Design a protein around this ligand. Structure first.
Ligand code: K
Length: 263
């Protein structure tokens, strides 16, 4: 509803920065509302859902096993690795790494998983192959969060990310087992509390993934709906703001409040 675009524009005014937005019907794939649908924004940690989708695709194809153990060392640890820093000597399974990357946004977990699938080049190939001709991953953690103005590396377009998320969660790309595992990891998301979840009515379902990067970059992708069942996908990105993390979070939450109000 345009009343939600009012809030998106309010966010641009408050943040002094571009905000990209998509509200997509999960069933039909129809875009219900949008703002800067085809402009590029850094994906920041939201790319981790796409990463684990590629991992699950390989599991479906018999090229990977969720229970396979990956060993790593201090040489592999990058900043903010809450889970991987505790398992240096135990190693972690593919399943444990995806859980850490998505639910805890563990950065080393993401890099380890990227290596298993062939790196940014292969994630990009996977995306192009499933119909997303614009989303691209070029670097690894932490450089992929640089958000240099006008840089197309490691970016997506709101409309593309929305339709890609719909395909991964409800399309035929992944098996039913893998589709469900991916959304379950997203429903257990532990670090997106100040965003859409803060405006979600009691009883509603939400499976999401948020991210933050340099130069004010922030983003969230989500499947949400009433009665504990998802029925729409929401994608929100912003980059360039000099505002505090709390201010960026408040603006995103307000957009969420409005789309819930006009559902
Ligand atoms: K556009």
């Amino acid at each position: 509803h345009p009343e939600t675009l009012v809030k998106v524009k309010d966010a641009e005014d408050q943040l002094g920065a571009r905000v990209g937005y998509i509200e997509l019907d999960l069933n039909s794939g129809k875009i219900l509302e949008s703002f800067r649908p085809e402009e590029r924004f850094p994906m920041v940690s939201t790319f981790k859902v796409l990463l684990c989708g590629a991992v699950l695709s390989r599991v479906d194809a018999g090229q990977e096993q969720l229970g396979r153990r990956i060993h790593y060392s201090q040489n592999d640890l990058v900043e903010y690795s809450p889970v991987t820093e505790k398992h240096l000597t135990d190693g972690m399974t593919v399943r444990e790494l995806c859980s850490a990357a998505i639910t805890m946004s563990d950065n080393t977990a993401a890099n380890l998983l990227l290596t298993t699938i062939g790196g940014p080049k292969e994630l990009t190939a996977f995306l192009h192959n499933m119909g997303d001709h614009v989303t691209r991953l070029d670097r690894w953690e932490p450089e992929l969060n640089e958000a240099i103005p006008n840089d197309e590396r490691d970016t997506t377009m709101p409309a593309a990310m929305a339709t890609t998320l719909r395909k991964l969660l409800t399309g035929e790309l992944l098996t039913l087992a893998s589709r469900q595992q991916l959304i379950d990891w997203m429903e257990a998301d532990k670090v997106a509390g100040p965003l859409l979840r803060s405006a979600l009515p009691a009883g509603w379902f939400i499976a999401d993934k948020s991210g933050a990067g340099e130069r004010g970059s922030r983003g969230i992708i989500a499947a949400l709906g009433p009665d504990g069942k998802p029925s729409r996908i929401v994608v929100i990105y912003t980059t360039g703001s000099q505002a505090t993390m709390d201010e960026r979070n408040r603006q995103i939450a307000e957009i969420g409040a409005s789309l819930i109000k006009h559902w």
